Structure formats: structure tokens, C-alpha cells
């Protein structure tokens, strides 16, 4: 925040056939200030994909034994990811890398073509260990259904 950097949360891309299970990464980049908080929502086409798993990269998201990485899929077509350092000091994100992995199940009767994975830019939150805004930026991904 003193650096006035813009942290980017990006969703990756993946291709798969109808009925396949596909993995797409979520990445954080341009990290400078140690990140203690991340809130982000990812929108997806529910008629085409079913969320199977949303798992963290433990080589970057530490202290997952104390619920530092929370996933919410209670809303159709939306994945809410919340990262928080439970200690407010010991387990920040301080390097660029993969934050989590999204596993989708492609509906067997899904149509071929791209389907965007959209990061809601109005709800994206990134803050330092004392909950002070870090400038954020969203980058969308997608799933390409092959036919």
C-alpha cells in the first residue's frame, strides 16, 4: 500500500470435452506488500459446469489447518474464496504463485465453445496484515468445451 502496487487475481483457462473433469488455476501476481486478506468471487456457467473442488496451493496458502482458506459455493454459478491469515503476521502471501485450483465437471450435454470464468471486480478485496486496502485488479479465465 505504501508501494501503491496493484495485486492481480487471475483465473486460468482449460479445455475439456463434455463429461470431463477439468482443473483451472487461480493465480496472484504483482504481490509486494504481505497479503493478509483476499476476498474474491468467481462466476461460472452453471448449466455447463458443476463445481467439484476448490483447493488451495499449500506451498503458498499456509495455516490451512486453522481455516485460512474458506470456500463458499452456496450461490448457483458463483465461487467465493476468502483467504485470511489467522495469526495476522506469521502466514501472509508474499510471492506470486497459484492461490487455488478449481475442479469443474463439464455437463455431458454441454455445447462446444468458450465459457468465461469471471472475477467480480466490485467485490474483489485484498489487504495487508492489518486489514489495509491493497490496490487490486481482476483478470478473467474461461473453459473451452471441445466438440
Amino acid at each position: 500500500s505504501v508501494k501503491n502496487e496493484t495485486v492481480k487475481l487471475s483465473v486460468g483457462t482449460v479445455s475439456g470435452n463434455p463429461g470431463d473433469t477439468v482443473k483451472v488455476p487461480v493465480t496472484i501476481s504483482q504481490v509486494s506488500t504481505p497479503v493478509g486478506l483476499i476476498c474474491m468471487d468467481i462466476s461460472y456457467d452453471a448449466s455447463k459446469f458443476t463445481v467439484k473442488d476448490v483447493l488451495p496451493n499449500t506451498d503458498l496458502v499456509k495455516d490451512t489447518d486453522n481455516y485460512s482458506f474458506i470456500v463458499n459455493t452456496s450461490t448457483p454459478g458463483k465461487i467465493s474464496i476468502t483467504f485470511t491469515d489467522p495469526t495476522l503476521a506469521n502466514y501472509p502471501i508474499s510471492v506470486d504463485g497459484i492461490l487455488a485450483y478449481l475442479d469443474f465437471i463439464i455437463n455431458s450435454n454441454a455445447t462446444a465453445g468458450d465459457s468465461a470464468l469471471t472475477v467480480d471486480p466490485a467485490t474483489l478485496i485484498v489487504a495487508d496484515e492489518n486489514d489495509k486496502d491493497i490496490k487490486d485488479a481482476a483478470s478473467n479465465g474461461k473453459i473451452t468445451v471441445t466438440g
Binding site: 483476499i38 485470511t84 478485496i125
Partner: protein
Amino acid sequence: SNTILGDLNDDGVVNGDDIVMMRQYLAGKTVSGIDKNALDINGDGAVNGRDLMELIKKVSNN
């Protein structure tokens, strides 16, 4: 009549038991005994990870 900021279980104190409720609520679990009126800790109109962040801060500052 719950006038304690972050007291989700309305027991008079702010500790890790309230953190547990916030975490479970943010994951979409049904939290029995939770005071939904106490979730918006920073009074910004939404209940999200920044309320959990504020709650963890309040406990450490106690």
C-alpha cells in the same frame, strides 16, 4: 439487545468461539445459536472475509 461488537454467539465476550461461527458462516454452513445481526462488524453492508479479518483483530487486541 446485543451491544458487543463481534459477539456472534451473544455470550458477552469476543473470543475464538465467535471466530469459529464467522468462519462456519462464511463457508455457508448452518451455524446454530448464531446472531445474524452481529455479522457485519465493519458496518459496510456486507458479510465477507473483511468482517472475519476485523473479528480476528479485535480478539488479538483484547
